[PDB]
Symmetry: C2
Subunit: 82 residues, 2 copies
Amino acid sequence: GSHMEAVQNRIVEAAERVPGVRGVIHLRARYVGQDIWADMIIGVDPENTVEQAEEICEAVQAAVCGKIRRIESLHVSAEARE
Amino acid sequence: GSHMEAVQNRIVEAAERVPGVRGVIHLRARYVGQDIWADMIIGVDPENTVEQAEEICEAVQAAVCGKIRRIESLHVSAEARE
Ligand SMILES: [Cl-]
Protein backbone atom coordinates (compact mmCIF):
# COMPACT_ATOMS: atom_id res chain seq x y z
CA GLY A 1 0.00 0.00 0.00
CA SER A 2 0.79 1.49 -2.53
CA HIS A 3 -3.02 1.34 -3.22
CA MET A 4 -3.78 1.99 0.48
CA GLU A 5 -1.75 5.18 1.12
CA ALA A 6 -3.72 6.99 -1.61
CA VAL A 7 -7.01 5.78 0.03
CA GLN A 8 -5.80 6.89 3.48
CA ASN A 9 -4.91 10.33 2.07
CA ARG A 10 -8.44 10.66 0.69
CA ILE A 11 -9.97 9.60 4.00
CA VAL A 12 -8.00 12.18 5.97
CA GLU A 13 -8.73 14.95 3.44
CA ALA A 14 -12.48 14.17 3.44
CA ALA A 15 -12.64 14.12 7.22
CA GLU A 16 -10.67 17.34 7.71
CA ARG A 17 -13.14 19.22 5.44
CA VAL A 18 -16.11 18.48 7.77
CA PRO A 19 -17.08 21.37 10.04
CA GLY A 20 -15.67 20.98 13.56
CA VAL A 21 -12.96 18.42 12.81
CA ARG A 22 -9.62 19.45 14.40
CA GLY A 23 -7.38 16.99 12.66
CA VAL A 24 -7.43 13.24 12.25
CA ILE A 25 -5.66 11.84 15.31
CA HIS A 26 -5.70 8.20 14.22
CA LEU A 27 -6.73 6.19 11.17
CA ARG A 28 -6.47 2.44 10.68
CA ALA A 29 -7.75 1.14 7.34
CA ARG A 30 -7.68 -2.43 6.10
CA TYR A 31 -8.85 -4.34 3.05
CA VAL A 32 -11.62 -6.89 3.56
CA GLY A 33 -11.63 -8.33 0.08
CA GLN A 34 -11.88 -5.31 -2.23
CA ASP A 35 -13.66 -3.31 0.47
CA ILE A 36 -12.14 -0.97 3.03
CA TRP A 37 -13.00 -1.16 6.71
CA ALA A 38 -11.62 1.68 8.81
CA ASP A 39 -11.47 3.06 12.33
CA MET A 40 -10.77 6.80 12.94
CA ILE A 41 -10.35 9.26 15.80
CA ILE A 42 -10.88 12.94 15.11
CA GLY A 43 -10.01 15.95 17.25
CA VAL A 44 -12.79 18.31 18.31
CA ASP A 45 -13.17 21.53 20.29
CA PRO A 46 -13.04 20.54 24.05
CA GLU A 47 -15.92 22.88 24.73
CA ASN A 48 -18.27 21.30 22.13
CA THR A 49 -20.96 19.24 23.87
CA VAL A 50 -20.90 15.44 23.73
CA GLU A 51 -24.01 15.70 21.51
CA GLN A 52 -22.19 18.06 19.09
CA ALA A 53 -19.13 15.80 19.04
CA GLU A 54 -21.32 12.82 18.14
CA GLU A 55 -22.84 14.92 15.34
CA ILE A 56 -19.41 15.75 13.98
CA CYS A 57 -18.49 12.05 14.05
CA GLU A 58 -21.67 11.18 12.16
CA ALA A 59 -20.99 13.95 9.61
CA VAL A 60 -17.44 12.58 9.09
CA GLN A 61 -18.86 9.07 8.56
CA ALA A 62 -21.26 10.43 5.94
CA ALA A 63 -18.65 12.58 4.16
CA VAL A 64 -15.97 9.89 4.04
CA CYS A 65 -18.33 7.08 3.00
CA GLY A 66 -19.88 9.38 0.41
CA LYS A 67 -16.49 10.29 -1.12
CA ILE A 68 -14.74 6.89 -0.99
CA ARG A 69 -17.04 4.27 -2.47
CA ARG A 70 -14.93 1.26 -1.47
CA ILE A 71 -15.35 1.96 2.24
CA GLU A 72 -17.99 -0.45 3.63
CA SER A 73 -17.37 0.14 7.35
CA LEU A 74 -16.16 3.26 9.13
CA HIS A 75 -16.14 3.91 12.88
CA VAL A 76 -15.42 7.45 14.02
CA SER A 77 -14.75 8.57 17.59
CA ALA A 78 -13.70 11.94 18.98
CA GLU A 79 -11.14 13.41 21.43
CA ALA A 80 -10.70 16.96 22.73
CA ARG A 81 -7.91 18.80 20.84
CA GLU A 82 -6.56 22.37 21.22
CA GLY B 1 -13.53 -1.12 -15.40
CA SER B 2 -14.61 -1.91 -12.67
CA HIS B 3 -11.60 0.18 -11.43
CA MET B 4 -12.16 2.77 -14.19
CA GLU B 5 -15.86 3.65 -13.66
CA ALA B 6 -15.09 4.77 -10.08
CA VAL B 7 -12.20 6.95 -11.45
CA GLN B 8 -14.46 8.41 -14.16
CA ASN B 9 -17.10 9.25 -11.52
CA ARG B 10 -14.47 11.12 -9.51
CA ILE B 11 -13.28 13.01 -12.58
CA VAL B 12 -16.78 14.18 -13.48
CA GLU B 13 -17.59 15.14 -9.88
CA ALA B 14 -14.33 17.13 -9.53
CA ALA B 15 -14.89 18.95 -12.80
CA GLU B 16 -18.54 19.82 -12.11
CA ARG B 17 -17.54 21.51 -8.82
CA VAL B 18 -15.31 24.09 -10.62
CA PRO B 19 -16.92 27.50 -11.08
CA GLY B 20 -18.36 27.95 -14.58
CA VAL B 21 -18.53 24.30 -15.61
CA ARG B 22 -21.94 23.47 -17.15
CA GLY B 23 -21.65 19.72 -17.19
CA VAL B 24 -19.08 17.32 -18.55
CA ILE B 25 -20.03 16.73 -22.18
CA HIS B 26 -17.41 14.06 -22.90
CA LEU B 27 -14.76 12.14 -20.98
CA ARG B 28 -12.41 9.49 -22.33
CA ALA B 29 -9.99 8.02 -19.79
CA ARG B 30 -7.47 5.26 -20.36
CA TYR B 31 -4.79 3.47 -18.38
CA VAL B 32 -1.19 4.00 -19.47
CA GLY B 33 0.42 1.54 -17.11
CA GLN B 34 -0.95 2.45 -13.67
CA ASP B 35 -1.46 6.06 -14.75
CA ILE B 36 -4.59 7.65 -16.19
CA TRP B 37 -4.52 9.78 -19.31
CA ALA B 38 -7.79 11.55 -20.09
CA ASP B 39 -9.47 13.90 -22.53
CA MET B 40 -12.54 15.96 -21.47
CA ILE B 41 -15.00 18.48 -22.91
CA ILE B 42 -16.90 20.71 -20.52
CA GLY B 43 -19.91 22.93 -21.16
CA VAL B 44 -19.62 26.65 -20.47
CA ASP B 45 -21.82 29.75 -20.63
CA PRO B 46 -21.98 30.80 -24.38
CA GLU B 47 -21.53 34.40 -23.35
CA ASN B 48 -18.29 33.80 -21.38
CA THR B 49 -15.30 35.12 -23.33
CA VAL B 50 -12.82 32.74 -24.97
CA GLU B 51 -10.30 33.91 -22.34
CA GLN B 52 -12.72 33.02 -19.50
CA ALA B 53 -13.47 29.64 -21.07
CA GLU B 54 -9.75 28.87 -21.24
CA GLU B 55 -9.48 29.84 -17.56
CA ILE B 56 -12.28 27.47 -16.64
CA CYS B 57 -10.54 24.67 -18.58
CA GLU B 58 -7.29 25.37 -16.74
CA ALA B 59 -9.12 25.41 -13.37
CA VAL B 60 -10.72 22.03 -14.23
CA GLN B 61 -7.29 20.61 -15.11
CA ALA B 62 -5.93 21.79 -11.76
CA ALA B 63 -8.92 20.55 -9.72
CA VAL B 64 -9.09 17.13 -11.35
CA CYS B 65 -5.32 16.51 -11.30
CA GLY B 66 -5.21 17.72 -7.70
CA LYS B 67 -8.00 15.34 -6.60
CA ILE B 68 -7.08 12.21 -8.60
CA ARG B 69 -3.40 11.47 -8.09
CA ARG B 70 -3.16 8.74 -10.73
CA ILE B 71 -4.01 11.15 -13.56
CA GLU B 72 -0.75 12.07 -15.37
CA SER B 73 -2.30 13.72 -18.45
CA LEU B 74 -5.56 15.62 -18.78
CA HIS B 75 -6.71 17.72 -21.75
CA VAL B 76 -9.77 19.90 -21.24
CA SER B 77 -11.67 21.77 -23.95
CA ALA B 78 -14.91 23.74 -23.81
CA GLU B 79 -18.20 24.07 -25.74
CA ALA B 80 -21.10 26.51 -25.32
CA ARG B 81 -23.98 24.91 -23.36
CA GLU B 82 -27.38 26.34 -22.30
CL1 LIG C 1 -8.04 1.29 -7.60
